[PDB]
Specification:
homotetramer, about 350 residues, alpha/beta, Aspartate Aminotransferase, domain 1, 2 domains, seven-stranded mixed beta sheet, three-stranded antiparallel beta sheet, 14 helices, about 45% helix, binds calcium ion, binds sodium ion
Chain lengths: ~350, ~350, ~350, ~350
């Protein structure tokens, strides 16, 4: 089918499948897997950091980072619509015993003044603000790119207060492709960065956390506690190396396809705003249709297109490697036919 | 000094000092604690009650008794549980707060409904909604009974518990005319303070169903609130609950007078917003910010707390007489000349 | 009834009642209660430490100490039969996220070599051992006194590893009166000590934690989090000062009464060991009786004597200010009658 | 290269596994759409006679999500005093679940049922609630010892009477089964949940599986999401797991035969080992009759081409697995014989 549900559904490339088959492995618990070691070395190098740690998921990447940055009772400033707050099962409270301090943002960009104001003064009644998290290409807002200046401004505030900064860069390469800002530049204004290998980059499993050597050592211990300490994970790391080193540039194609899809959907008559499409996500409202988002998703599935409803009136369409321009053209033919039925 | 920092500074009345029969509460044998809890449960129309050393403990054992690890707790964005309880909900219960904006403590029921998490693997389970009555941060504002009723209805629909942080619920009752028993009927649990406007030296009480209170009592033991001959404290608590409620009206009168007169001097206050024992004073029209003005106030005989860089909270209580208020106003008058 | 269940049942003396009624108080949250401040000053001085913190209970005292000494995932070495492990509702795991590491002891004295062996090596699989707790006048062994030499040897081991030492001194003054070792000497070989005011010292409520200034500041914030931050607690502190300054010497009376009780129980024929009784507790075994401990407790209760069973064959008898020699004599007459019935 | 007797975790994928992983049919497991993971879980559930199963990236995660699903904050978990959950899982039970471990000493990994019974907390405000009893099968620390089915049966009876959950840390449960002749479904029949590893003796590169009732597995799956074990196209890993379960269990007998040979021969040389205690893939060697300690002996073995781990200042653990052949065992033995001349 034509899967526009998310970029998480990307499948391994033929190059990845071959590398997994001949991957050199070892027990990572002993630090003896050569491929995992190389993946971490490459990731550290790529983001200009001292060290890196491979994890089974972006969620674990964010959570081990929070654990490594905080102490029980601490508070973590984060954007009110960020993944760490909305889609990580309340893990920060259970695993680290910390409280989130949601700060509103405009498409992922928290006003530097609101962030500075959310920092807790030193008082017996108050938690200690020890971490500030920023999400780049903010998911909930529709894959928007957080301006480099916003990140730089918040980094300055953090520095003045002795507060750590973590960038949830699950889709940081999409941000870099859209903005022209190198990932090293983003990373320089953060103490840690988590980036996904299993979304737009097409690896089957995993993410990576990069940061200072001492922070990574603490995160590695947290990873062991959480259950992310695998054995011969080099099989996964082999695909990860290809994802990191060879699948970044083509993300531009996903952006082009998302924009083309949006422009054409608007032409048909669907409620979409092509001007809001900055990366690989398109938000489709169903207010003008005879059925709501849930009913329209079912009609789409019957015609060969998969998508998710994110509310009763909104559907999200996400492009990726496994959605070609031909697939986009085919999907548009289907959307055209469904508009005749449901407008 | 003229202490306007909080109503927590109230000292025991002579009758409280004399009242302060005991036993070991761990064995449930302190008769005065037992009578205090019996009286509290009766007053709020609940099955059981639990004495605790502080309102923070009262709120926290209630959260522990209402939730499981990983749950989410809907609460007002400027509520005490979120801002002034040291992140205890995350450490003690492993729960995540889900702040919802409110207008003077009143969360729009529709916003509360939208904050409830659907059943999905990525989401915590919303198991509790907390409402703070006479919302501190907004100036000791009274949350409308209709707001609480509506939220209770939503909670019922979804099978979610409701906890009322009633640290100053009697102040609310006195101002609104709504009996505390009526407020409590729309909640599963209520925590109310004995150590603030009611003048007891120590403690608060949590009221609710018998099974919830049993869970809260075990949580209290875990937290370290299981005392021995606490009847010494309970004796003052009974007097606070049974003899000190009516006079809260005097604190409201003094707060309103203070606010009215401060407005006349020229300070940035809103006398029409003052319905209980608190006055929010803004410093945007002064030459110094809240922290600087608090220091000046201290040097002239007046104690108050800054609640932000531009806001000061003034609180009245039994130990601040009308004469004290008049004396404070003379001081505020002099300081307006200096910093305006 | 004649209460031998625990020394927690002690009621305030007339002196304490007057002091509580006349207590000079203030708001302790602002550090303004003069009586709490004097009690803490006196407590610190008495234990030879720079700071102290009054708490509502010994459990809170131990738990805030654990919170202030550890970080999530740490391990706490403690005696296998200690109160922190058995009677504190699993608080160490919930509040501090730490693991207990039980070590056997002989009457509360953990073999120093066993303690050194229980310290975890630096390995990703292992928690960090950051605290060693020692209980003085170890309850479960029968109110036994831990030798100063034992604490001294453990202190040296702790210093070598950079590990903190906490003494659960709930009944430390009973230990001091029996051994002749000043409480400041026991405390000199520990980082922190918690002692109770509400047991043998007769105060109605509370305990105190003593230690270094930084540690106490962290313990004070932990106390706020747990809910032990009270307002005009000077009412309780007034009785606390009398407990500390005027009720220590008379503990020797409780020790004398416990010894007399044990000797006479042995004379009657009960299975007791007077040679093991050096403080205010007597362990009585029901081995030679036609009933188990629980059934014996019931028989005692029906005859006017209260006590607790500590196992299916052992019951604990505890003396205190509120059980006089006359009461011990009357209890013995009852014990004599019951021995004829169940022996 | 060196003879690695450090652990069975070092097993490398077989040629068949490598091909199945690279060519695995995958999908997004978060949506429950990876066909290979789904088949691995179906097969695992069936093998253990349970309704459901959950793939996890490690045995530690398997145990921890099970503890999370079986307990509430403040609960106590009875477990053997030398078990992996207590010693080698980074204190995770306290941090993740807020539960207290209640160690019960065991005899060769087996806790006496009456000691388990006595460890259950009475209902009292001072005591945590005992909600889970964990049993480790082929108990590692004692030397890969096999816990009898009757021990597990008796504990199950006690747990049922008290309404307590039972979890089997079956990291090496197939080793127990091969040695005892007891099908794994029989061990599992006396437990609410069982975690078993695919990445040790079964030779898969990554992961373990938890089996149990549908509702428990659903709760464990949500715990897995929270801990970060919710992967995407994990079918790549599951492909090797299916082969581990279907083709690598019977040969564990070879690992046991190799360990028995190793022990018998080490005894003949003069080392302090007990061949009579060796029934699975582990041999405990004490250094009591050597003029060196445990760590020093490990260093000497390393210098001679043999890798092992010290588990005490006087104990070393030798583990056999697919990647150590009988010829490798003979080589190690010949070296052990000589190093016996140097250190005795
Ligand atoms: Ca993927
Ligand atoms: Ca007061
Ligand atoms: Ca007492
Ligand atoms: Ca007499
Ligand atoms: Ca392996
Ligand atoms: Ca050979
Ligand atoms: Na911590
Ligand atoms: Na729970």
């Amino acid at each position: 089918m034509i899967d526009l549900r998310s970029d998480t559904v990307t499948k391994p490339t033929e190059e990845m499948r071959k590398a997994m088959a001949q991957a050199e492995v070892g027990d990572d618990v002993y630090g003896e897997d050569p491929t995992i070691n190389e993946l971490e070395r490459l990731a550290a190098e790529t983001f200009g950091k001292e060290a890196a740690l491979f994890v089974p998921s972006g969620t674990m990447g964010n959570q081990v980072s929070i654990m490594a940055h905080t102490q029980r009772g601490d508070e973590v400033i984060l954007e009110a619509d960020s993944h760490i707050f909305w889609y990580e099962v309340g893990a920060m409270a259970v695993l680290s015993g910390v409280m989130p301090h949601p700060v509103p943002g405009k498409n992922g960009a928290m006003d530097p003044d609101d962030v500075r104001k959310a920092i807790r003064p030193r008082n017996i009644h108050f938690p200690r603000t020890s971490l500030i998290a920023i999400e780049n290409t903010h998911n909930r807002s529709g894959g928007r790119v957080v301006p480099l200046e916003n990140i730089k401004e918040i980094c300055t505030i953090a520095k003045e207060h002795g507060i750590n900064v973590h960038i949830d860069g699950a889709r940081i390469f999409n941000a870099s492709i859209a903005s022209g800002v190198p990932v090293k530049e983003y990373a320089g204004y953060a103490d840690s960065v988590m980036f996904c290998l299993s979304k737009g980059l097409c690896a089957p499993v995993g993410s990576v956390v990069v940061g200072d050597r001492d922070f990574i050592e603490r995160a590695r211990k947290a990873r062991k506690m959480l259950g992310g300490g695998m054995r011969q994970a080099g099989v996964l790391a082999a695909a990860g190396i290809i994802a990191l080193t060879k699948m970044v540039d083509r993300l531009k194609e996903d952006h082009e396809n998302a924009r083309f899809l949006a422009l054409k959907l608007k032409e048909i008559g669907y409620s979409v705003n092509p001007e809001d499409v900055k990366t690989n996500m398109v938000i489709l409202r169903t207010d003008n249709l005879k059925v709501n988002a849930h009913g329209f998703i079912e009609a789409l599935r019957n015609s060969g297109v998969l998508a998710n409803a994110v509310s009763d009136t909104e559907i999200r369409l996400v492009t990726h490697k496994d959605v070609s321009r031909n697939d986009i053209e085919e999907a548009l033919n289907i959307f055209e036919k469904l508009f005749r039925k449901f407008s």
